[PDB]
């Protein structure tokens, strides 16, 4: 109920969709002065400022990153590495964090909702949704996250389908 | 001592005459060597 | 013994035959040349004529004379009034029977000539006379000195050997002079002690023979009605194409020829010695011939690559000598053999732009091949190591740049040039 | 040895019945048939001199 409204209020201005002949196939992320955007989602950036840049690539981590200018670094998402197990907020409701794995109940999940960040009860991004795999009744996510050292860890289960 | 050309008779002074000039009655070699035994 | 081989040509004859050039036009010449065989080396030719040599006109064995027919009757002159020449004058050595031996330079023809009265006899036949040198050095007149090689010249003697020529009966020689006229008749007067046969065709057909009888014919009142031949029975002539042959197929015999070809020794010239200069796997030759001189070179390996060249002017002939041998023959000199050894330009013991040129002048192909493959191996190794270095630097810095904090730790900054 | 001929009578080719300086016209007839004969050379040498 109110969780989707809080997601729409937090991700209103900072989330920009990716257009491809009128089709919405992905979402970029503006956090820490960086613009995260995946490889398989191909299209034009809806924002005029973020589209006229050059994104350095990382095909192993599956991330394109760039440098957000200084006049927009205050209007970004927050990030942290301290995460316990339990529940977190996602755009279609809730997501479970168990044994270092993000799980989503079934019914939701198609092609197009790639790049949506995972939020917490405070308002900090803990993961970035990149792919998903159907596991019985409860699907698992293939995402990226950080740690205390500062190494971007990409978690990928078996036989995932890119969204 | 023989001559080089295969049909010659050799005088006393080394000069070689033709082989039929040896006993011919006409003096061919110096000191008449060819006409000594005919 | 000497007569033992002269009496065989004592039983033949001389004769007359047709020549082409006999000092005015063509005529029947007593010195008609049958053949000129010139295969001896230092210029010795062996003619065969019609007139005979070394015999007396009556039939005895006179020393140096020539015995020629002259319109049926046989004459003689001393041999030192007979002269012949091919292009320059020749020198008669000796003669025996039909065969003269001479010494001649080269030419297109031979003209044998003499002069008995104030009437000059000649005969020119277009037979090539050639001068054949001995050895690998080509001269026209034999040298004053040199070395002696095996040569083959016509033997000056006259000994019985394998060769024979065949003498046959003469044919009926015709005689216009023998026929004559009475007041109104035709008289055939044979010569002294001589038979003849007469054939006339004025009335019927007449074939008659006389034996030393001056016969008057009553019919046939023209000279041209009668042909008077002459009969020869105790003599031979050579089996020539210039004489008619007698009836009956008897050849009656054959005689051996003088002056055959035998094995002798001839002095050959000797060339000036070359001036031999050496180079690295090379021998140069400065060659100054007197007369033209063959140069024969070959290698002492599996492929000889031989060379053969008649050199006549001063020449310089740079050759290549490998470590397997080389050999030249210059003139009548023996073969000189040469062998190369390992002297390459360069120092094999350091300064790496010198060892490359040493082992390149030593082995040209292997040095290029080895340096090419070593440079390719070194290039692939350096490029692959730099590729793996860039791969590991990307693999180090990829997790640390995707973080929004954008910091690099202390060790991985300087060691990977992260800044 | 070799037997030469002048008629149907064989004789050794070193001892001829006739000589050229005795009868000249008949030695040629003697040397007629004796050409195809291995002893023509000995016959001619014996007919050279007496």
């Amino acid at each position: 109920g109110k969780r989707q409204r809080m997601v729409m209020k937090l991700e209103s201005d900072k989330t920009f969709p990716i257009m491809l002949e009128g089709k919405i196939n992905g979402y970029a992320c503006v956090v820490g002065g960086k613009l995260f955007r995946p490889m398989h989602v191909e299209g034009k950036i809806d924002n005029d400022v973020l589209a006229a840049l050059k994104t350095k690539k990382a095909s192993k981590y599956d991330l394109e990153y760039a440098d957000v200018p200084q006049n927009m670094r205050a209007d970004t998402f927050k990030y942290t590495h301290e995460k316990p197990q339990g529940y977190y907020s996602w755009h279609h409701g809730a997501v479970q964090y168990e044994n270092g794995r993000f799980t989503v109940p079934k019914g939701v999940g198609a092609k197009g909702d790639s790049g949506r960040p995972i939020l917490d009860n405070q308002g900090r991004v803990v993961a970035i949704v990149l792919g998903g795999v159907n596991e019985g009744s409860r699907t698992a996510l293939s995402v990226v996250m950080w740690n205390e050292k500062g190494v971007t860890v990409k978690y990928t289960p078996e036989n995932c389908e890119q969204w | 001592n023989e001559c080089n050309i295969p049909g010659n008779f050799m005088c006393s002074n080394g000069r070689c005459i033709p082989g039929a000039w040896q006993c011919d009655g006409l003096p061919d070699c110096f000191d008449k060597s060819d006409e000594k035994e005919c | 013994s000497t007569e033992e081989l002269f009496n065989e040509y004592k039983l033949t004859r001389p004769y007359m035959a047709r020549c082409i050039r006999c000092a005015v036009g063509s005529c029947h010449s007593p010195i008609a040349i049958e053949a000129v065989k010139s295969d001896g080396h230092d210029g010795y030719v062996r003619l065969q004529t019609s007139s005979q040599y070394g015999l007396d006109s009556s039939g005895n064995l006179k020393g140096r004379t020539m015995r020629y027919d002259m319109h049926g009757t046989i004459k003689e002159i001393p041999l030192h009034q007979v002269s012949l020449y091919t292009s320059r004058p020749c020198h008669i050595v000796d003669g025996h029977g039909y065969f003269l031996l001479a010494r001649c330079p080269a030419g297109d023809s031979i003209t044998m000539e003499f002069k008995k009265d104030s009437v000059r006899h000649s005969c020119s036949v277009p037979y090539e006379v050639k001068f054949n040198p001995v050895g690998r050095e080509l001269y026209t007149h034999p040298p004053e000195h040199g070395v002696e090689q095996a040569c083959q010249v016509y033997a000056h003697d006259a000994q019985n050997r394998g060769a024979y020529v065949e003498m046959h009966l003469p044919g009926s020689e015709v005689d216009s002079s023998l026929v004559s006229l009475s007041g109104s008749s035709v008289t055939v007067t044979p010569p002294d002690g001589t038979s003849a046969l007469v054939e006339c065709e004025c009335g019927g057909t007449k074939i008659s023979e006389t034996i030393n009888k001056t016969k008057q014919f009553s019919q046939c009142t023209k000279k041209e009605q009668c042909r008077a031949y002459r009969l020869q029975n105790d003599k031979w002539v050579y089996n020539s194409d210039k004489l008619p042959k007698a009836a009956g197929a008897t050849l009656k015999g054959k005689l051996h020829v003088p002056f055959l070809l035998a094995d002798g020794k001839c002095t050959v010239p000797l060339a000036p010695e070359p001036m031999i200069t050496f180079g690295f796997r090379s021998v140069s030759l400065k060659l100054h011939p007197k007369n033209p001189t063959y140069l024969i070179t070959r290698q002492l390996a599996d492929e000889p690559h031989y060379t053969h060249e008649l050199i006549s002017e001063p020449a310089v002939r740079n050759f290549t000598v490998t470590e397997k041998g080389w050999e030249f023959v210059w003139g009548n000199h023996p073969p000189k053999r040469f062998w190369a050894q390992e002297t390459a330009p360069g120092n094999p013991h350091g300064l790496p732009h010198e060892v490359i040129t040493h082992y390149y002048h030593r082995y040209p192909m292997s040095t290029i091949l080895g340096l090419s493959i070593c440079a390719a191996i070194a290039t692939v190794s350096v490029a692959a190591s730099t590729w793996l270095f860039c791969r590991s630097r990307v693999a180090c810095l990829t997790p640390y740049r995707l973080t929004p904090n954008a910091r690099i730790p202390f060790c991985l900054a300087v060691l990977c040039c992260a800044r | 040895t070799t037997m030469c001929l002048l008629a149907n009578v064989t004789f050794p080719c070193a001892q001829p019945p006739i000589c050229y300086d005795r009868k000249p016209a008949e030695t040629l007839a003697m040397l007629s048939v004796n050409v195809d004969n291995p002893g023509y050379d000995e016959l001619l040498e014996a007919a050279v001199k007496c």
Binding site: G100, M145, N147, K154 | - | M16, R18, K37, D39, H71, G72, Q152, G162, A163, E173, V174, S176, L178, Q225, R227, N239, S240, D241, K242, L243, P244, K245, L260, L261, D263, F278, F280, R281, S282, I296, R298, Q299, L300, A301, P304, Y306, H308, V321, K336, W339, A340, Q341, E342, T343, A344, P348, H349, V355, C374, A378, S381, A384, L388, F389, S392, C396 | -
Partner: protein, 442 residues
Amino acid sequence: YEHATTMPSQAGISYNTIVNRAGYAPLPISITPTKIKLIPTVNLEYVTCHYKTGMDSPAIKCCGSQECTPTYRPDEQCKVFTGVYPFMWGGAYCFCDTENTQVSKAYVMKSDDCLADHAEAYKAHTASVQAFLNITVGEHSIVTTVYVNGETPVNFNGVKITAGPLSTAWTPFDRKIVQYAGEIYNYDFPEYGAGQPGAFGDIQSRTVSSSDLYANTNLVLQRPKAGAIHVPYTQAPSGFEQWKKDKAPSLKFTAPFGCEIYTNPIRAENCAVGSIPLAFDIPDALFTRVSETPTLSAAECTLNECVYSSDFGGIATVKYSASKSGKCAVHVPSGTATLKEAAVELTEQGSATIHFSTANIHPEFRLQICTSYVTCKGDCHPPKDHIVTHPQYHAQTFTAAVSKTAWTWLTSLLGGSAVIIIIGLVLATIVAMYVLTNQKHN
């Protein structure tokens, strides 16, 4: 004692080897080949020379008609000519105007000069190499003629030597051979009957003293000139003279491996190809116990001079300490160097100077002195003379002239690349393990 060795086929250069029966003194063998022949089986087929056209005398009949008679002479041409009107020296020969008839006849016979000037067409197969050896088995010499087949030994003083078969069946003689004027030509002549005019073989004859000769000389009778008696003919000029003008140089100038083609038996001498193996059967009476010969201890070798030359460009000194004074054999069992000496006379104490010849720029060979083995090591230097007049007294090797500088520039640039690529592999492995190790925490 059975002893087998392998001598290279090249005359003039000495060959040394020693027999090593164990409990006895080593026996030196020195064999120098004087002459090495190669005699093929040679079968005469026909001989050839200049021809000689024999022209028969013209048979003339006045107001008649002659007839042609065959005589079966070689290349015998016969034609009869009518309407001729001949002249002699003493007037006309006939009285008729026409209807006169004349026979021209011609035939080809051998030249008068054939016994001295001719060529011989032969055939070659199945050569037998034959050699002159000068053998020194234990300071005793003999000159020996031996056949190199797999049999035919030679026996002197109980020593038995069998020259093994040549490694190569090469011959400088082809299938067909022409011998002319002492020299031997490698020509391809036509068979007895296939002789064509103008070229070699237009006159053929089975022997020089034969009686039946083939002639194909293209003889054609022409018509005699009006008013003359002669036989005119027209044929091709001689094939033997044309062969003599168009000779290639003989086989003593064009044959490979330095063969020397000699005449009187057809043979090639001193032709350096292949290798001649040997075999010995030595009686035990020529050997000697070791204790009656100088046995040595503590020998050391140093190189005084070392020039990689074709001749003996090396001088080495062996400093020894033997037990008795006498001779003993010296030999290098490898192919690095070749000793000149093969017998060094020793005292009880001193130095021995030997002469070797090598092609290594850095020689290292194991020399055998009397019954021991020393190691001579040095460096050779290049010679200065570019061309010599004697052959090479040793045997070349691969990697023989490679210098220690060249080995350094090979090794430091060829194995150093492998060092760089394996430290690249180790660096990539350490980076992969470190990055995967930091990613295990989550």
